[PDB]
Design a protein around this ligand. Structure first.
Ligand SMILES: COc1ccc(CCc2cc(Nc3ccnc(NCc4cc(C)no4)n3)[nH]n2)cc1OC
Ligand SMILES: COc1ccc(CCc2cc(Nc3ccnc(NCc4cc(C)no4)n3)[nH]n2)cc1OC
Lengths: 279, 287
């Protein structure tokens, strides 16, 4: 049996499980998630263990939930809304983002859903930096910050997910997560907020290429050689010299010299206000 | 070889006496040939010196390497003169090693020329389109003379003192073989040339598109860190190199057109020369 936390506990008859969202996370409807409004349904995402899970997988899911409780609420992160911990499988209830991951969102909006202006792209970057600055302020290190791990809501709000290793392992889309990793995290296994800033630099590149794949055709061994040579990704087209300078600053060889998330948030705030929405 | 082991046939139209050629510093070398800087005393008519490039065999060459050098010289005679190609000026074929005398381009290859001029002799957007126009004009002439290049890349384009673009070097090939700079020549090859060994003027158009990419990236390296096997996989997926920064949508559409999967759907060198001529005239010299 699991211990019961009344702040977060939702009765099981208040949760209507729906279609799976991805491979497990399912779409669901929560009845009266808020105690003050018991007659309203909220579309939510529910994370649960599969039938083949072990006692280690359960402790991992519990730890993720406990971590989300400690971190607290922020507009630019996927927030915890509740849990079903008693008399049945553990359900971790989180915010639902209907427009999917940021990579897919940007790809679907490439020129021939709707079209994104230059100001909208800088706004995505600002929102992600904002969420990262909050997570860093809570002493949290992400370790896999990428566009695939950023979710977009119905109201186009950016929300960071999975915040709370074999180099040759590939993702579902067939990409290599090492391509987002700072050299000190890759070669010395040193993970800091500065190593996440390097990953944010790769994320900025993904935004301004509208869901572009980093280093296409490059295997792990060749990437290690590019990083050792001090190779850096090329300036995307439809990217200012100022935004490319930001990416390059995030990719400083010396971690202490990279900008912080606080600086990135301030710079991005000023750039948004100066960026045209007319193209 | 056809008596060439002991003596070469004469061609008085092109023959320069050996005492009228002063061999100088080497410019570069391959597996069995080499290129040296030289001074030629009175090429035309009479006593003035011209700085020239001389191609000759290395001391380890075979009869096959000699027949290859002879064939290159004979091909250059057939092709004729054009401003945007390295032209034949003469030869020393009798009583000694074969010397193939060609035009000297002092500012080196286009890849180095563009890299040395990256911002910190700056080049404007009109200068870049002008390089592209000049290469297309040289290629249009070579194609009109039934010459298929097979290795059209910025490394094989030479730049003279007056900034004129001149094309040089106009189962046997190993895909895994690298250049001096450490690049893979397969990254310039058309898919039909790569997968079906079909070489045409349309396959050279594909290479010109990769050359256009090299110009607008100011000597940028195509597909860095990509091995041969992965490149084959990118081409099979219909992957295309990204639009460089400081490159118009019109010039990127030109590159993409050059990279059409169907060779008949690619522009011809005649069409590229016409398009580039119109673009140059409309391109600013102010940036
Ligand atoms: C306990 O740890 C987690 C905390 C939060 C999440 C995100 C839950 C979620 C998913 C969605 N919206 C969509 C829309 C379209 N497609 C998907 N696919 C599923 C998917 C993508 C990612 C990123 N994570 O799950 N989701 N909103 N909210 C997943 C977590 O575990 C992997
Ligand atoms: C019959 O085949 C050829 C016909 C012409 C040539 C080019 C001759 C030449 C070289 C130069 N100027 C410089 C300047 C700086 N560095 C060099 N490097 C030498 C080099 C580069 C390439 C391309 N070919 O040779 N050359 N001007 N003119 C080469 C040929 O075969 C390899």
């Amino acid at each position: 049996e699991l211990p019961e936390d009344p702040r977060w506990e939702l009765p099981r008859d208040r949760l209507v499980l729906g279609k799976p969202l991805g491979e497990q996370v399912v779409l669901a409807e929560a009845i009266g998630l808020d105690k003050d409004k018991p007659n309203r349904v909220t579309k939510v995402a529910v994370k649960m263990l599969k039938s083949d899970a072990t006692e280690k997988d359960l402790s991992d899911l519990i730890s993720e939930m406990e971590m989300m409780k400690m971190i607290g609420k922020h507009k630019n992160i996927i927030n915890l809304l509740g849990a079903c911990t008693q008399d049945g499988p553990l359900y971790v209830i989180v915010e639902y983002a209907s427009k999917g991951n940021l990579r897919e969102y940007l790809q679907a909006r490439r020129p021939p859903e709707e079209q994104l202006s230059s100001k909208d792209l800088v706004s995505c970057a600002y929102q992600v930096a904002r969420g990262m600055e909050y997570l860093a302020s809570k002493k949290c290190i992400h370790r896999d910050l990428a566009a695939r791990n950023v979710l977009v809501t119905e109201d186009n709000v950016m929300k960071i997910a999975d915040f709370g290793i074999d180099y040759y392992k590939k993702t579902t889309n067939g990409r290599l997560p090492v391509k987002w990793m700072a050299p000190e995290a890759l070669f010395d296994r040193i993970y800091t907020h500065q190593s996440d800033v390097w990953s944010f630099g790769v994320l900025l590149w993904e935004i301004f290429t509208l869901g572009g794949s980093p280093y296409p055709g490059v295997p792990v061994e060749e990437l290690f050689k590019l990083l050792k040579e001090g190779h850096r990704m090329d300036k995307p087209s439809n990217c200012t010299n100022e935004l490319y300078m930001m990416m390059r600053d995030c990719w400083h060889a010396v971690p202490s010299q990279r900008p912080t998330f606080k600086q990135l948030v301030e710079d991005l705030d000023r750039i948004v206000a100066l960026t045209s929405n007319q193209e």
